[PDB]
Amino acid sequence: GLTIEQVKDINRRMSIGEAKARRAKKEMVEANLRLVISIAKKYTNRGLQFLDLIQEGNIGLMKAVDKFEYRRGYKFSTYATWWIRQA
DNA sequence: CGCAATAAATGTGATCTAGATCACATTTTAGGCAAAAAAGGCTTTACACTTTATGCTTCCGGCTCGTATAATCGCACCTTATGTGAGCGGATAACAAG
């Protein structure tokens, strides 16, 4: 129900906001890889290998960083490790 | 015709069974025909099969969610110590050529 010319304008500016945020979150999911292996000692030999253990650990950190609020009393080193041990 | 010698054939005749007779009265035999007891026949009725739609209920079954919590850390102690040679690529030292 939109013009083929203007419909592109809506999406072209969405790739700008998601890009400035994506690259900005690539620095938090790289310097915090030490916390993933830290709590990865509670689910070692059980049924899944260690190589596939930090798999659900890295995906969890990338989820918490997105739903994180710097304007909140709780820090990140505690709020992020919540979704990690959940995956 | 008389003579040889191992096998087969000969007589005896009193004793004791073996096999046969007769005509008529008694006892056995055969297959015959219904009845009873049994085989399957071919009916018509008594019941029983799992199946499958369903939906309602309680109990046991199988699966997740968020929350609450402390942490993102720390010693001293017990007992051993794989086997080799053969095949291979890579790193280093000694060498002749330029």
Curated annotation (Swiss-Prot):
Protein's UniProt name: RNA polymerase sigma factor RpoD
Source organism: Escherichia coli (strain K12)
Cellular localisation: Cytoplasm
Region (Sigma-70 factor domain-2): 28-87
Function: Sigma factors are initiation factors that promote the attachment of RNA polymerase to specific initiation sites and are then released. This sigma factor is the primary sigma factor during exponential growth. Preferentially transcribes genes associated with fast growth, such as ribosomal operons, other protein-synthesis related genes, rRNA- and tRNA-encoding genes and prfB.
Family: Belongs to the sigma-70 factor family. RpoD/SigA subfamily.
Disulphide bridges: none
Motif Interaction with polymerase core subunit RpoC mapped to chain: 52-55
Whole-protein residues included: 352 to 438 of 613
Domain notes: Contains 4 domains, connected by flexible linkers. In the active conformation, the domains are in an extended conformation, each making extensive interactions with the RNA polymerase catalytic core. In the autoinhibited state, sigma-70 factor domain-1 packs closely together with sigma-70 factor domains-2 and -4, contrary to the extended conformation that is seen when the protein is part of the RNA polymerase holoenzyme.
Oligomeric form and interacting partners: Interacts transiently with the RNA polymerase catalytic core formed by RpoA, RpoB, RpoC and RpoZ (2 alpha, 1 beta, 1 beta' and 1 omega subunit) to form the RNA polymerase holoenzyme that can initiate transcription. Identified in a complex containing RpoD, the RNA polymerase subunits RpoA, RpoB and RpoZ, CRP and DNA. Interacts with Rsd; this prevents interaction with the RNA polymerase catalytic core and with promoter DNA, and as a consequence, promotes transcription from promoters that require alternative sigma factors. (Microbial infection) Interacts with Escherichia phage lambda antitermination protein Q.
Taxonomic lineage: Bacteria, Pseudomonadati, Pseudomonadota, Gammaproteobacteria, Enterobacterales
